[model samples]
Target: SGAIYVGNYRVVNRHLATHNDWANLVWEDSSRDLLVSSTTAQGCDTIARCDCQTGVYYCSSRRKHYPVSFSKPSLIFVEASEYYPARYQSHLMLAVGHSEPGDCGGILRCQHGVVGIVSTGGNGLVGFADVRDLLWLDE
Candidate 1:
């Protein structure tokens, strides 16, 4: 067991899930004074399920906070192939060409909905772990 300090809150109980090179961190914040909340919880809309295809745009950011600041949006041409060598791999992963070296674990959003979490990237292409499976553990 381990912990991570986010701003003023200390998250002690954490759950992690991974497949191959893909991974994600899950945790709960029980503090009365919440340190973080999703945009959907704050009156913004979100897509519970989003589809993947060519020319689709997905935005992401390294930090999670209100007035979220997303970096340059990337285009997902299609599902990733095994030919792409990155730290993460999965059939549900999308192939994007925009992401930073330290962007792993960041949220991948499609319009107002979440699609996946940044997993791995290189040579200008980034892979994201689909959120559908992760949602089951989140609850």
Candidate 2:
């Protein structure tokens, strides 16, 4: 198990294996407001936040990370692969088109705020692991 502080939450129990993919359970401090404020709105449009221009884990060599814009709500099934390939539900996956392999672990944000983290990609599609459940955890 591992823990790291990100913004108002302390992300814990990171799992980066073939069975769990790259994921973490987040815990927030009560003193702080929710990471995703109620003011933020959610609709069809979403974007993969790729402000950081650097290498990412579970990516092919020489692949460069880049930002992705999603036109509408989408989901995809990620097949098992050499890199983190655990079975995940369709609701747990967000599809972003034309994402680079190096974009793995990138943040997916929408008007509603931070939503998911990039997990895997191939053939012009990228899968983002939803973090809503983890964020809702009381502890």
Candidate 3:
């Protein structure tokens, strides 16, 4: 087998094969439009499923996708974490603590298109901040 692997992108549709057991998955149903259940894990998966209709993520369990705003997290945190599937969707969290008062942000972008576009976390703000976008590139 004289071969070397080279690629720009890849997908292991059958990811479960590698895991001896299943990692915990989170399911979300915020849009309530499509039946896509997006999920995430601290180290399980990293891709969100978008609603075919409303364009929102069928995120793990929370009302929205994870976070991807600040370089870190915040005081407010996800209390009731839910369960779904690591093979389905991913995360994009947002932190709520800030170097500046009256504003804190916690966000972590995944590597896939979330419901056409990700726009639900980050202190009610829209669009990926400059730093965040750059972070995505770094990943």
Arranged by TM-score, best first: 2, 1, 3
Sort the predicted structures by lDDT, highest score first.
2, 1, 3
What is the per-residue lDDT of model 3 for residues 40-124, given as tens digits with 9 covering 90 to 100?
Answer: 3222323333222222222322334533333221122222222222221222223332211111121223444321222223344
Residue pairs with backbone atoms closer than 3 Å in model 2 (clashes): none
lDDT of 1 by residue, 64-119 (tens): 32222223324333324342322223333546366654454455555535544454
**How does candidate 1 fare on TM-score?**
0.39
2 against 3, candidate with superior lDDT: 2
- Candidate 2's C-alpha lDDT? 0.39
RMSD values, in order shown: 11.8, 11.0, 15.6
Give the higher-TM-score candidate: 1 or 2.
Answer: 2
Per-candidate Cα lDDT values, in order, are: 0.36, 0.39, 0.23
**TM-score quality measure for candidate 3:** 0.17
lDDT of 2 by residue, 1-139 (tens): 1122334344321233222222332222211111221112232323233332222222233344445543232345446655435454343353445565455545555544455556556777665554554433222
